[PDB]
Amino acid sequence: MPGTKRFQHVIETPEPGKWELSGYEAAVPITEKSNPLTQDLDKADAENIVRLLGQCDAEIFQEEGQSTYQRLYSESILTTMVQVAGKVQEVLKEPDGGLVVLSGGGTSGRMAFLMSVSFNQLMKGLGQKPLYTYLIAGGDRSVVASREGTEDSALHGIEELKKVAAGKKRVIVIGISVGLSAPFVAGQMDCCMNNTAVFLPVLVGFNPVSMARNDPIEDWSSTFRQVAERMQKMQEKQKAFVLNPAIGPEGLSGSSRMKGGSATKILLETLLLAAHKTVDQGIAASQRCLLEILRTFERAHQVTYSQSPKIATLMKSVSTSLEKKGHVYLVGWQTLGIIAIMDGVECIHTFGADFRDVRGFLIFTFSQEDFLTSILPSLTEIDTVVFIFTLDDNLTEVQTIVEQVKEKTNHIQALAHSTVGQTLPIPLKKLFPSIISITWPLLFFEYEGNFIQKFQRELSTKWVLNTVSTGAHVLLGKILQNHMLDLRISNSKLFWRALAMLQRFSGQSKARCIESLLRAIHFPQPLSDDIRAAPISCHVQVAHEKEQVIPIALLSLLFRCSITEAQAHLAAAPSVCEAVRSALA
Ligand SMILES: C[C@H]1COCCN1C[C@H]1CN(S(=O)(=O)c2cccs2)CCN1c1ccc([C@@](C)(O)C(F)(F)F)cc1
Ligand SMILES: O=P(O)(O)OC[C@@H](O)[C@@H](O)[C@H](O)[C@@H](O)CO
């Protein structure tokens, strides 16, 4: 029938009580799963939220139990990390005609950017030509923009790869897709297997290959799963690699910007840094060198979340500023500035928030005075302003801007990284009464710009900002249990996540859920056979432009009513959340 092909991969909705027994839950990719720890995230208070998300983040370092999926510390994974460092080494010995690409969509693309900068610095600091570069779905401007739609083309990913692999003789392509999902990466990886003489594909994500994405890609013949299954066979001959530990579900279901983006840096910084740090020693990469670095990243989480109460407080101030109708400014220096901007942008698609709601700033890339003349005047009693810096930064540029921001605002908490024994100038820096001081041990670093210190600090800032941006929105009641129900469908994965949320919350059949979603997307047009049979990209392109698609679809189903009736009910209610929750009662 019309649509049977498009929706063939959709598993039927199970009867109540058989969600486990039907085999449905076992087929939900780890990355999309409901994290049991956060079943009541929507009820947790600020302090609980910090705790629940700290716990979730800790899962990245949890070891493999006794049958079960491999994890970061499992020997299969560390062995693979070693073999990849090794391949990275061959290139590093032979920089002429060598390149190393880090590629991903969305937050994977953002992580790829940071890491390619860092390792480019490191080879500069040694006076070697930079061998690294990034590739992000939608070109360079996707780094600091919400552009969720650009990950859905495999030809675009291959094109970008073609641009950059120029007339190189030896290219390593690290395809990063947390969900082993993005069509952007799948075609990069497949292209690589078709020219092994030059390309070496390495795929990074956090699903087992048997849960890799398997619905058709509109511009490509193979699925991500097939691609990944074939790379896995190539790994026996060391011609492709898959690096895919389970780190457990996200605390907000499917929000791979969080653990996924964290585990991406942890995993790839660890392995790249081992590789460099051991080439110049005339030693192979070994599990032992990786381990040192992993354990440092694991200390970094303990260090970070020991500041929990102050993280919770900052969340309560971010949440208030937004509950009223203020704005939140995230102001930071060098790469923490960027991480800040990345965080604020992700809030647009993640929570349906305006670009002003949580915005990042680097010293998007504004000057001391420029920020002072331009942005400073727009501030107000109710806003929250966050400063994010090292004691190594230029604290005279820092102290100025806080001086000036104190005038027009008082909610100004801050996030300061220091190596132990450094002191915070102005002991009357009770400009910041209750700072977030993260103090780091002394570690032995033989490289120039202390990269392990950079990586620690970036990760810890990432975690604080992610937990804050995310907690602030849950407190406002925008999250339903641990699901973001009212997302904007802006790519095929989101379209599938929407369909899944409909099955999970209504309990009704696949055909009904699908019908209600398409009716909601295409209203006021009725369901035709063309619409039913359309590529998912047509549904996406229409939904992207609307509001409350998913909640309307769900109300239609719960009330067993039309779209006209569900839209009128939604308008009768005080809020979307209240409409939905009271309909769920
Ligand atoms: C639509 C459902 C059921 O049929 C198979 C597809 N399922 C959706 C899964 C996976 N999709 S995906 O195909 O884009 C993908 C595969 C691999 C990486 S992405 C994404 C969303 N999925 C999903 C999401 C949420 C659920 C929930 C909502 O049931 C819960 F979060 F609770 F698990 C279930 C499945
Ligand atoms: O790395 P993946 O699974 O290919 O996901 C790629 C992107 O969709 C993802 O990073 C998304 O932009 C974030 O908003 C998820 O919280």
Descriptive account of the structure:
This protein has 585 residues and is an alpha/beta fold. The chain folds into three domains: 28-326 and 442-488, Glucose-6-phosphate isomerase like protein, domain 1 (Rossmann fold), CATH 3.40.50; 327-441, no CATH class; 489-585, no CATH class. It has 21 helices and ten strands. The strands form two sheets. Strands 2-1-3-4-5 form a five-stranded parallel β-sheet, sandwiched between helices. α11 links the parallel β6 and β7. α2 crosses α10. The longest helix is centred in the C-terminal third of the chain and has 25 residues, at 451-475. It starts with 23 loop residues before the first helix and ends with a helix. It binds the ligand C[C@H]1COCCN1C[C@H]1CN(S(=O)(=O)c2cccs2)CCN1c1ccc([C@@](C)(O)C(F)(F)F)cc1 and D-sorbitol-6-phosphate. Residues 104-108, 148, 151, 177-179, 181-182, 255-257, 346, 349-350 line the site of D-sorbitol-6-phosphate. It is classed as carbohydrate binding protein.
